Amino acid sequence: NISVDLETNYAELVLDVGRVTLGENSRKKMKDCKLRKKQNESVSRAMCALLNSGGGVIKAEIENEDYSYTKDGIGLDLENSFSNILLFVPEYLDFMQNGNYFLIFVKSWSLNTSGLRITTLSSNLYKRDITSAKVMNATAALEFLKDMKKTRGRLLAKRPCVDIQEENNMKALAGVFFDRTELDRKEKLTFTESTHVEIKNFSTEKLLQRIKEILPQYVSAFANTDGGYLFIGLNEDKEIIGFKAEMSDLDDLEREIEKSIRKMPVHHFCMEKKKINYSCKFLGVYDKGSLCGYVCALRVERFCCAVFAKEPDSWHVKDNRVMQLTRKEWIQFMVEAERITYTPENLCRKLFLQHEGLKQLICEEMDSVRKGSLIFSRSWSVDLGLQENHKVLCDALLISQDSPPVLYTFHMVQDEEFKGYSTQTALTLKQKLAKIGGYTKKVCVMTKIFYLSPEGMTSCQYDLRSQVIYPESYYFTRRKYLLKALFKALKRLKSLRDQFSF
Amino acid sequence: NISVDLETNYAELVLDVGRVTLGENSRKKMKDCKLRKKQNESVSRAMCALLNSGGGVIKAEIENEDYSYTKDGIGLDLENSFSNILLFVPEYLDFMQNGNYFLIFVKSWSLNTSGLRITTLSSNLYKRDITSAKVMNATAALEFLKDMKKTRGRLLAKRPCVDIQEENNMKALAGVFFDRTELDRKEKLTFTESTHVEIKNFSTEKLLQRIKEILPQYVSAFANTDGGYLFIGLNEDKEIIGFKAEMSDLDDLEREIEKSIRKMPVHHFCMEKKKINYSCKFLGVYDKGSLCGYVCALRVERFCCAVFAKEPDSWHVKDNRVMQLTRKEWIQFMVEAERITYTPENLCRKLFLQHEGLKQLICEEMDSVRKGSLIFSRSWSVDLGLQENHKVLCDALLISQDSPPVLYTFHMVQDEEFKGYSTQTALTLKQKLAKIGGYTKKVCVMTKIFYLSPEGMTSCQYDLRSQVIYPESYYFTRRKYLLKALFKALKRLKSLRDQFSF
Ligand SMILES: [Zn+2]
Ligand SMILES: [Zn+2]
Structure with missing residues (x-):
């Protein structure tokens, strides 16, 4: 009874677990223990799936009325389940009561000294x-x-005659x-x-x-x-x-x-x-x-x-479905081990020469950035292993220390919307950074979509940052570690050609 | 209130924890909960010390009368403590009711996939x-x-104006x-x-x-x-x-x-x-x-x-005292990572030529061994880092698959007893094999002491195997792994000269 929310504006996997009662007093006074256990199981399964699938959001409809997160809390059983799943809850989980919904932002599981590659609710061994x-x-x-x-899997010995019990x-x-x-x-x-x-x-x-x-x-x-x-x-x-x-x-x-x-x-x-x-x-x-x-x-x-x-x-998420691992x-998984820089130079020069307004738009956008790196590609979707969209002129990824990574999509089509393509590309980029890249901190990817008029007029059709809200921990990222994770992910995806200049 | 037993015949650290009540019914019906908790704490401390000190025996006087291990058991609290300390109890612990005493044979803690180098009752973090x-x-x-x-140890971000609770x-x-x-x-x-x-x-x-x-x-x-x-x-x-x-x-x-x-x-x-x-x-x-x-x-x-x-x-054992780790x-420990073969040939030939009866005694002893390796030394105590005993002519270590390792001490002094020297040497050898050597299975070392008369008469003054009893798991050893552990221990002790012929 867990479904992937496709109508969300977030650029990540959002799992809807249905109506969930929240609050310590509210949950401890639930008459139906079966319903409480079912809700706990659904939340735990969603959390495990997000941990094993590169992180995401758990969205739960607040069943009980007049619920305030600050005044009521979460619930003892849910917290115990989270502690069982995760050694350090604050390192992975963030909680936010947004209107009538409760959002649990879950960071991807990272390999650590314990050696675990995935998270398991119960090994059943x-x-x-x-x-x-x-x-x-x-x-x-x-x-x-x-x-x-x-x-590859797994007589008597002579002993002194002593009356012993074993x-x-x-x-x-x-x-x-x-x-x-x-x-x-x-x-x-x-x-x-x-x-x-x-x-x-x-x-x-x-x-x-x-x-x-x-x-x-x-x-x-x-x-x-x-x-x-x-x-x-x-x-x-x-x-x-x-x-x-x-x-x-x-x-x-x-x-x-x-x-x-x-x-x-x-x-x-x-x-x-x-x-x-x-x-x-x-x-x-x-x-x-x-x-x-x-x-x-x-x-x-x-x-x-x-x-x-x-x-x-x-559990994990495959093909937009929450599936239990076979x-x-x-x-x-258990037994088998594992200023502003404009790159690449040639592609940046070609894009700036072909489109004059693109350079002006880039300068206007980057005037507000203290320090960061901007990487251009013909289609960042291809580099992440997805299908190419020929209508998109180019994509730009901005990595800065003061802001989360931002993906800039540019298109020449006035009457078409590229929100879904950009959102999917950002989701895939976040997942690759978290799992393949090796980034061990909370990361979110914003998107900005621009229309490049033939006469040089630029308009911001879609701005993801102004429409979604994250916990503050997601708004501060480590630029060097982000670049290292991106380099590792591109190398492992066989799509690293000239993104980083040596 | 834990003391090292120096009067025991075992060639290992024996920790006496005093009178301990045993049995599920007996322990669950103890009127004094403070005494029960104290006994549990003493047993747990002794087990942790033995795990961190190369293994040994916990000897507990059976306080309750008419106690049968087969009919009564151990006790729920003790078993829970053992499970908390050790992931797999049968891999490390053996239980034996010997007369009025209860013996817990504890194997040394071995480095595993978890990465732990020592065992802790409670990290207090x-x-x-x-x-x-x-x-x-x-x-x-x-x-x-x-x-x-x-x-080396461990501002605000602009967000959309959304009424959220965190x-x-x-x-x-x-x-x-x-x-x-x-x-x-x-x-x-x-x-x-x-x-x-x-x-x-x-x-x-x-x-x-x-x-x-x-x-x-x-x-x-x-x-x-x-x-x-x-x-x-x-x-x-x-x-x-x-x-x-x-x-x-x-x-x-x-x-x-x-x-x-x-x-x-x-x-x-x-x-x-x-x-x-x-x-x-x-x-x-x-x-x-x-x-x-x-x-x-x-x-x-x-x-x-x-x-x-x-x-x-x-906890651990140092200088025959159970001391809590600073x-x-x-x-x-937590943060910092880590036929019959007669060798050496020259020493064996010299010993056999100097003493004719020694060769006959060795042949008589080894006629009952199917296959194994016998290693001679001037003083095996020195190779383990202990003080030299000049009265001992030579020492011999026998490693066989069907029997536990046996240390043969030979002396020319008729009126002197070398039981303590041989027992200490065997204890040190077992500890070095368990910790420095890397042997991950249950191992015990027996001792045999012989007097070499000048006329060639040989007598077995002391035979450890006939006087002590172990669980059957200790009587079967892996010869190749024992040799590998001995080689590693000798290499790390800077006492590997010609024990293994290449
Ligand atoms: Zn099998
Ligand atoms: Zn400090």
Whole structure:
């Protein structure tokens, strides 16, 4: 339910997430928790997509009435989600209440010391923290995947006769318990939970519902750490209780378990692809010579490669659509490493000689600039990898320290509008600077469109800066770093010919 | 209250943490929460010290009686602490209940994709997560410190006249509120908490106690992110309440705030050292023409470098003492990057010719080894940087795939014991292999001591393997990786002359 806004005046990706309730008191008092979680999920997905797609704006309609950002705030859950996604929120996020809408300006994710290339809401990779199954964070998932990639995946020793207790004792006891044909009710186990043992108690009515939900994460955790045994039908005090069911119910539960396990995504770094080796068994529980219920014992063998509970929760924007990254793409991102100067001189001279009014217009525009660089091109759209527009005479990019980059479009057609072309070119330039260029600061690109009359009259048809508003951080840019990022982006785009004079 | 155990037979650092209650039920039912937290802190400090000092063993006396590791477990809080310290607990930790003691075998911390060189319980660096002050994790602290080190530390722009609301509005409103000479009781604020605003309500009796405790972390968070304003004396609904106090109480509170702020550690990456720029003000609250109480407003300016709430909580073992890393050392670690083969041939030939029984003893010992490498030295203690023992004839290190490394000490003195020398040499060798060598797997070093009689009689005085027990993971080692780590350690120790023949 996230759509790219094509009617916006901003020269960047604007994602509309629909009506969102804002304010700490307003969000904490929302009666419908499902709606609040859905709004949080939509905002988080939009933020992740913008982080992975070169930055942009999240536009949310303010659902609650009489909302003031200064007086109310944002909301604890949204802030917690932002903190989970981003280590330093002020470095990436800006908030602005514009009329009835809330704008979250999101900077592109930049490679840092952590080594992460993309942002993930949840890697859906689980591990065993001695007794608990926890979803690997970005750093843990990165380390796990790189270690498995490097190694293409992943008897007894004589010891002194000393009476010791280890996790191997619990694993052996659980294995012996697994092979028991029948069980006795109200008997205590000789083992407890460990890296290879998990014990859960579920009601009969909720068992089928929870098998589709919690079993995948425990199976992923076991297959990722060392394998293990999951026992369902034992209470907190390790007493055998079980759940009452019929043979048909047992068959249906076994089928559901098989479907849930086979649905789990699996990525292999080895040459020999393998399935998840699991064994499901049902042990009858006998009380006073009568069958009380059944205990479900699931043995999950150690897996050679990554096992996912669900597809990794990473998003991006492609073809003006918010798409979740496929497992292969996510794995590839995780494991695979990465005065005024008028240039070029020849093109500037040709443009100034062919069109006399263009030079006067450039001088008038640049009289207000303290120091900067102006780069001319026949079509800046082509240099960014987009389609050429033959009606545009030329494009000019201005990089100055006191102002954000400005793209100057010039056209000879009086009755045609070039707002969309210039906006798309500026959006692509910003994305290339952020991702390919390597610029690590907040950057926005403004546009100015001019009509060059044959008699030399110049008029400013469109001025982007006077129609859109940004946080102040976007209005101050580092000229040297901008030039370096532009040089790197042009070099990587195979469109660097004479933009920088050496 | 953590001491290095010098009476242990293990050839590694054994840290005794005293009596520790173990078991999930036992620990969750502990009446004294202070004692439980103290035990958890001691175990965590010992684990961090062992991780930073080349690995070792944590020995804890089992306080509770009738404790079985297989039946009871470890404890939720201890497991959570271990998970916080280590991304993958099974990769580093092994647990063993030996008699009345509990042994935690800890592998040395190895450099990984995260870039961390040491482990920290808490960096004590705080940041602002929009409304909350949170302690930077290891990755966040690493990124923050490296960014500040790289840059040697760390007007208005014209915008369209659009009615918008940002965090700057809240900051300006808080600044205006800061300069007010007097306040009126039961009036609502025009701003709320943000990246630059924190609002807390404290009782009069607990105000002095909490100033020494919670003020440093908020001051650190403000000085680390963007500065801000802290307001004490306002309830949840942003109504001005204040706290009743006298002028002497105000002076004492101001002195306590000054002492607390000046006590905070500060590290500077810039040339010009600066103090924490803060301003403390007390605003009277007037109700019906009478003074009700006072509101404390603290303005913390943005700081140029790192501000610590406390010294970073990182530990190591030096001179057989568990010492907390100093701030300078912690900063330096964070920000600054890093058949049977008989060698050497000449020394082996000389030893075999001088002592005939030595060759026979070596052959008898190596007849049981499938494949490995034996390296002889005049004194392996010298090659590891320790003091030479002239009574020891020679030392031999055996590296095999089926067995852990074994150090063979040979002596001609019948009435003297060399257990301590061999144990210290093995401990130093293990530490050098783990840290300097770069070995990333669990490794233990056994020792065997032999007496070479002048007539050629050989006797095994001490055999370490038969007297100590390790988890099975320590009994299987990678021979090629062990040789590579040994080569790297010898090269970095300037003691590599002819150990490996090329
Ligand atoms: Zn595989
Ligand atoms: Zn400084």
